[PDB]
Structure 1
């Protein structure tokens, strides 16, 4: 029950020691205890934890990467935060600050004047230069020389000014102290404010630290990696990298990550911020930043689905990966590199493989275990693209993937030029029971297509979540028919299926499906959740079944959100959510390529090819809905609707977000950690 903490100095070792003693006093026998292993450096502590000689050490971002690499394979487990519990700020954001008075993008930096905090600083040098590496002219070695040849002039504090003079065209001499006015965070900023340089590579917070008034800050903007600009306020959507400030790492396997938390949590309570002046966890009597940044205001537990590559982020790992590997391509900078599609079944992999060979090597294939695994691969660049249902388009979005192409199902002449935006989830109720409004559904009897279905379960219950009486979903409706629920619950009490099929999600239920939940509506039921065209396709004599023959539209109204009621064909204005189509998701940086390659690919192997036995076609599966839903006719370009929030209804988002409170996703919880 003891955690072996690793110190990298003598001063640190001492702090660890009194950290042991002070935690020895307050904590009872059945409490965590601290041990103090002492090594020579951060690298040694890393190898020690790997060799199972120590348990935990707290690293900067650069070392977090080093730690995860073979043969160490360490992972982040506990993080320092630097604000309050509502504003944690466990991360910082390397930004590129510019005048609003200028007009140029990230990809137009070549030939501009730059301002760096200092050579070797992550935010002010490593990150930017790492991202810009391939855009620098050959030779890239040495780096200082290359960066000199990229910017017309620079202030790079702590550069070989005598060898690379241009790196100090803005601050002559390359002063690496506060005597150079263009040095550090405040200095790199003043380098911009004074109009000496065109761009300042700094932290998101730098601008707030140097300009108090929102008036002056508005004279500045941010360079986003997609070659757009945004106000200084929205760094969260316009940064060069998101960097974990200080992180605790342990073994990826057998790390005792729970003990570290159990310890560190009970430490920050007894000796956290403004706690005991007997011993400060975030203050050193013997130096500064011993074991932990004195900045820190506490700890947070890192969700367990988090690997190091996920925690640092694509951009961060790319920056340092370039600096180390230094391997740029040589292929025409115009032509799209192949798109790595992610498969999650054997049959998915097979179909993908065939696609790849006919794609003349323009499509590639990557296997992953689950959907959540495939999404992770997209995130960190192991894969490029995949098609997701609304539920996953949401999770991918929370992780910062973007919808680019919608699966079109309706035969449209120019469907390539029009997204669908899906059908409409409606709550239908007869005009008979006439005092029914959205509000007084509490304790009413209901009729769902099936539990886990979008229009039938997800959307309605998702929105009813605010008043759902806890994750107990059977408590809301006195009784109902939710095919798939446990065969003993209140939501199986209306399902008229004889024998084994009494509450089973299949045809033999009779009160299952869109058409079924509607029979459930009439045959013992108050309310039913279906699609917008379920009423018109079952009434008017469209359905010749015993119960359905003689039903008419005029009888059934649709329930609205605002509490009002409306006719059926007024669904457009009286709907719950806009149950969406499946959509191809990808990284923002590969948005351009996915669009083209997939447009060309659906031309060759699209819905427009017959003789699918002698020629490959993309929208036919061997089994069922491999890679894409087989109902797809084309892939619609998502102009405008190319964020998760903008592709899914604001209501769909609210609903799915609510349901995800009862059914956790380890990926989602990890992604929401980086983006709260």
Structure 2
């Protein structure tokens, strides 16, 4: 129940011993305890933790990468933040500030003039040079010279002015102190402001400290990785890298992550930032930043699904990898790199393999255990693309990935250029129902197609969430039939079909499905949640069966979320949410290649050629829906709907968002932490 903290210096160990002590005084002898293992350096601390001779240490982003690498394999368990918990600042963004209308993007930096905070610094050197690495001229070692030739001239504080002069061209001597006006963050920004340099590599907040007036700021832009610019305040959605400020790592297996959280959580409680002048956790008389930076305000537990690569982030890991390794592709230069497609099942891997061979290298396969694991892989580069359903296009989007092509199902001869939007989920009731309105449903009787389903649950049950704020849905409706709820719940008390299949999510449950929930409306409930076509299909006699043969379309009305009502006829203006088609998602940096490669593939192996017999077919499956949905006609180009927020639709996103409040998703809670 004790946590062995690692200190990299006598001072730090003294502070640690104080920590240990003041944590004994009032903290049940059943509550966490601190032991102090003293090591000579960070690497020795990282090693101690992996060799199970210590348990935790706090490191800068760079050592968080090192700690993650074999054979240590350590992960981020607790984070240090710098604001209020309303605006807990745990990250910071390495951004590239430039002057408005100077016309050039990240990939057009050769020749330009650079301003770096200081050589060896994070945001100001390691990250930018890292990414830029493959664009530097060989020999790339020594690095300093190679950067000197890349740029036309720059101000690289602390660089070797003597040997590679052009690096102090904007600041002769390269002074490594405030003496040199272009040193440090502000020094680098000023280098840009004074117009000595074209681009200045600094922190996101750097410009917000050198220009108090939005007016002047509006004259500066930030270079983004997809070779486009954006307003300095849109840094979160345009930066070279996202860096964790200060992180606490542990072992990946074992590691006592939970115990560690229980320690520091309480610690920050008894000695938080004001909590006491007896013992200050984020400061010391013996020094500064001992154990934890002094600027700290508190701690935050890191979602368990997270690994260093996820925590550090794609861009960051990319930058550091290059520096650490140095490995470029003197391969073509423009010819698209093969698309690695992630498979979910054995049968998926098998179909993907058949596909890979037939594509002749343009398609490759990667196998992950679950949809979320595939998403983590597309996230960190181990994989590039895969098709997802609404719920996952949402999750994937929270994680930074983006929808690129949507799966099309209907109107077949115009396909390739017209993204389908979906099938409107509508709430239904009988016109002969008393004033029933959207915001009136409480205590009513419900009819659902089945729990978990989109049109009959997630969407409706998802919007209704803002009218409760708790996940106990069975106790909102007086009663109802929701195939799948617990056999006893109120959601099961209106379901017919007896025996073992009472309230079961299969057709043996009469009230199951679209048609089934309608019958459930007609025979026991006042509200049914289906889709826009469900009624026209089950009226006008279009349905033989007893209970339906005489039902008439006009005897019903679908509820509109603004309280009013409208005719089943114009569902288009009175639905709950749209409900999308499956979409291929991929990383922003691979978006281009995915379009080119897939269009050419759906060409060669699409629904076009029907001789699936003696050749390959992208849309047919040995099993069922492998890789794509079998009823897929083509992959549409999501022209401008290329972001989950623009492809899903506010209503849908609102709902799905609300539901993930009830059903966790470790991957989502992790991506949320890094950004949302």
TM-score category, normalised to shorter length: over 0.9
Q: Shift of the alpha carbon at 1:521?
A: 1.4
The CA deviation string for residues 288-339 of structure 1, in whole angstroms up to 9 with x for no partner, is: 1111000110100001110000000010000000001100111111100000
1:292 is matched with 292
* 1:341 aligned counterpart, secondary structure: strand
Give the distance between the partners of 1:571 and 1:161, measured in 2 at CA.
71
Q: Shift of the alpha carbon at 1:545?
A: 1.4
Q: Shift of the alpha carbon at 1:96?
A: 0.6
Give the distance between the partners of 1:3 and 1:524, measured in 2 at CA.
60
2:473 is matched with 473
Q: Shift of the alpha carbon at 1:414?
A: 2.3
Question: Which stretch shows the higher mean deviation, 305-314 or 504-513?
Answer: 504-513
Q: Shift of the alpha carbon at 1:222?
A: 0.9
Q: Shift of the alpha carbon at 1:493?
A: 1.2
Q: TM-score, normalised by structure 2?
A: 0.99
Q: How does 1:331-480 map to 2 (within 5 A)?
A: 331-468=331-468, 470-480=470-480
2:532 is matched with 532
The CA deviation string for residues 614-660 of structure 1, in whole angstroms up to 9 with x for no partner, is: 11001000111111111100000101111011110101111011111
Give the distance between the partners of 2:213 and 2:664, measured in 1 at CA.
42
The CA deviation string for residues 232-286 of structure 1, in whole angstroms up to 9 with x for no partner, is: 1111101111100000011111101111111101111111112211211110211
* 1:230 aligned counterpart, secondary structure: coil
Q: Shift of the alpha carbon at 1:214?
A: 1.4
Q: TM-score, normalised by structure 1?
A: 0.99
* 1:205 aligned counterpart, secondary structure: helix
The CA deviation string for residues 106-141 of structure 1, in whole angstroms up to 9 with x for no partner, is: 111111111100111110010111111111122212
Give the distance between the partners of 1:38 and 1:332, measured in 2 at CA.
51
Give the distance between the partners of 1:325 and 1:148, measured in 2 at CA.
20
Instruction: Indicate conservation of the 8 Å contact 1:3/1:259, yes or no.
Output: yes
The CA deviation string for residues 133-168 of structure 1, in whole angstroms up to 9 with x for no partner, is: 111122212211111111111111111111111111
Give the distance between the partners of 1:603 and 1:557, measured in 2 at CA.
43
Instruction: Indicate conservation of the 8 Å contact 1:222/1:231, yes or no.
Output: yes
Instruction: Indicate conservation of the 8 Å contact 1:411/1:633, yes or no.
Output: no
Q: Shift of the alpha carbon at 1:469?
A: 5.8
Q: Shift of the alpha carbon at 1:496?
A: 1.4
Q: Shift of the alpha carbon at 1:346?
A: 0.5
Instruction: Indicate conservation of the 8 Å contact 1:469/1:476, yes or no.
Output: no
Instruction: Indicate conservation of the 8 Å contact 1:100/1:221, yes or no.
Output: yes
Instruction: Indicate conservation of the 8 Å contact 1:558/1:571, yes or no.
Output: yes
The CA deviation string for residues 197-241 of structure 1, in whole angstroms up to 9 with x for no partner, is: 111110011111111121121111111111111111111101111
Q: Shift of the alpha carbon at 1:543?
A: 1.3
Give the distance between the partners of 2:283 and 2:66, measured in 1 at CA.
27
2:628 is matched with 628
Tell me how many residue pairs correspond in the alignment: 676
Q: Does 1:579 align with 2:579?
A: yes
Give the distance between the partners of 1:492 and 1:5, measured in 2 at CA.
53
2:48 is matched with 48
Q: Shift of the alpha carbon at 1:541?
A: 2.0
* 1:528 aligned counterpart, secondary structure: strand
The CA deviation string for residues 506-559 of structure 1, in whole angstroms up to 9 with x for no partner, is: 111121111111111111110111111111111122111112212222111111
Question: Which stretch shows the higher mean deviation, 301-310 or 430-439?
Answer: 430-439
Give the distance between the partners of 1:200 and 1:526, measured in 2 at CA.
64
* 1:95 aligned counterpart, secondary structure: strand
Q: Shift of the alpha carbon at 1:101?
A: 3.8
Give the distance between the partners of 2:259 and 2:437, measured in 1 at CA.
51
Give the distance between the partners of 2:555 and 2:164, measured in 1 at CA.
82
Question: Which stretch shows the higher mean deviation, 454-463 or 425-434?
Answer: 425-434
Give the distance between the partners of 2:501 and 2:301, measured in 1 at CA.
45
Instruction: Indicate conservation of the 8 Å contact 1:408/1:632, yes or no.
Output: yes
Give the distance between the partners of 1:449 and 1:166, measured in 2 at CA.
70
Question: Which stretch shows the higher mean deviation, 205-214 or 664-673?
Answer: 205-214
* 2:436 aligned counterpart, secondary structure: coil
Question: Which stretch shows the higher mean deviation, 98-107 or 261-270?
Answer: 98-107
Give the distance between the partners of 2:90 and 2:8, measured in 1 at CA.
23
Q: Shift of the alpha carbon at 1:26?
A: 3.0
Give the distance between the partners of 1:646 and 1:560, measured in 2 at CA.
22
Instruction: Indicate conservation of the 8 Å contact 1:111/1:150, yes or no.
Output: yes
Q: Shift of the alpha carbon at 1:497?
A: 1.0
The CA deviation string for residues 453-477 of structure 1, in whole angstroms up to 9 with x for no partner, is: 1000000011001123621110011
Give the distance between the partners of 1:664 and 1:186, measured in 2 at CA.
43
Q: Point out 4+ residue stretches in structure 1 off by more than 2 angstroms.
A: none
Give the distance between the partners of 1:592 and 1:469, measured in 2 at CA.
41
Give the distance between the partners of 1:429 and 1:104, measured in 2 at CA.
58
Instruction: Indicate conservation of the 8 Å contact 1:7/1:39, yes or no.
Output: yes
* 1:13 aligned counterpart, secondary structure: helix
Give the distance between the partners of 1:147 and 1:305, measured in 2 at CA.
38
Instruction: Indicate conservation of the 8 Å contact 1:449/1:530, yes or no.
Output: yes
Change (3 A) 1:503 1:419: same
* 1:315 aligned counterpart, secondary structure: helix
Give the distance between the partners of 2:279 and 2:489, measured in 1 at CA.
55
Instruction: Indicate conservation of the 8 Å contact 1:394/1:644, yes or no.
Output: yes
Q: Shift of the alpha carbon at 1:412?
A: 2.5
Q: Shift of the alpha carbon at 1:588?
A: 0.3
Structure 2 regions of 5+ residues with no counterpart? none
1:64 is matched with 64
The CA deviation string for residues 575-621 of structure 1, in whole angstroms up to 9 with x for no partner, is: 10010001100000000001110010000000111110211001000
Give the distance between the partners of 2:489 and 2:21, measured in 1 at CA.
54
Question: Which stretch shows the higher mean deviation, 162-171 or 243-252?
Answer: 162-171
Give the distance between the partners of 2:32 and 2:429, measured in 1 at CA.
58
Q: Shift of the alpha carbon at 1:105?
A: 1.3
Question: Which stretch shows the higher mean deviation, 613-622 or 96-105?
Answer: 96-105
Question: Which stretch shows the higher mean deviation, 163-172 or 320-329?
Answer: 163-172
Give the distance between the partners of 1:492 and 1:265, measured in 2 at CA.
42
Give the distance between the partners of 1:190 and 1:335, measured in 2 at CA.
40
Change (3 A) 1:326 1:423: same
Instruction: Indicate conservation of the 8 Å contact 1:469/1:475, yes or no.
Output: no
Q: Shift of the alpha carbon at 1:28?
A: 2.5
Structure 1 regions of 5+ residues with no counterpart? none
Give the distance between the partners of 1:28 and 1:425, measured in 2 at CA.
54
Question: Which stretch shows the higher mean deviation, 536-545 or 593-602?
Answer: 536-545
